[PDB]
Design a protein around this nucleic acid. Structure first.
Length: 88
RNA sequence: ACUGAAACUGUAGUAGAACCAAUCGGGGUCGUCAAUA
C-alpha cells in the first residue's frame, strides 16, 4: 500500500498494489498486406531536431525503420487512414 | 530517464415577528305516580 501523486500526504493517493502471475507476452499477427497501429499510451517522438513534434511522417519513418519495412498510406477516400490527436 | 512541495470550504448572520385560550351559563327547584277489571 503506497501513496502516489499530488497531495499524497493528505486525503489523496492511497493505493493498494498487487502482483499477478507472469502474463503471456503479446503475440501480434504479422500481416504483409497492412500495418495497423493503435496508441495504447501517449507517444512521445523527437522531431529530427530532437524537439518534440507532431508530424506523423516521422512516425511513419520511425516504424518502417524499426520494423525494416516500407509503409504507404491507405489510399481509399471513403475510409480514413489516420486518426491522431496531439498531446502535451 | 524517476510521484512536486505546501494550502482548514472557511468567514458574518438569534428560527423569528404578531396573536388574551377565550365567549355564553344564579348550584338551581313541586306535583303526583301506576293500569286495570
Amino acid at each position: 500500500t503506497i501513496r502516489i501523486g499530488q497531495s499524497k500526504k493528505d486525503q489523496y493517493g492511497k493505493i493498494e498494489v498487487t502482483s499477478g502471475n507472469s502474463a503471456d507476452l503479446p503475440k501480434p499477427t504479422g500481416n504483409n498486406k497492412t500495418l495497423s497501429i493503435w496508441f495504447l499510451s501517449d507517444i512521445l517522438l523527437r522531431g529530427d531536431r530532437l524537439n518534440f513534434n507532431a508530424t506523423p511522417d516521422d512516425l511513419k519513418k520511425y516504424l518502417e525503420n524499426a520494423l525494416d519495412i516500407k509503409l504507404k498510406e491507405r489510399s481509399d477516400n471513403d475510409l480514413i487512414c489516420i486518426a491522431l490527436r496531439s498531446q502535451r
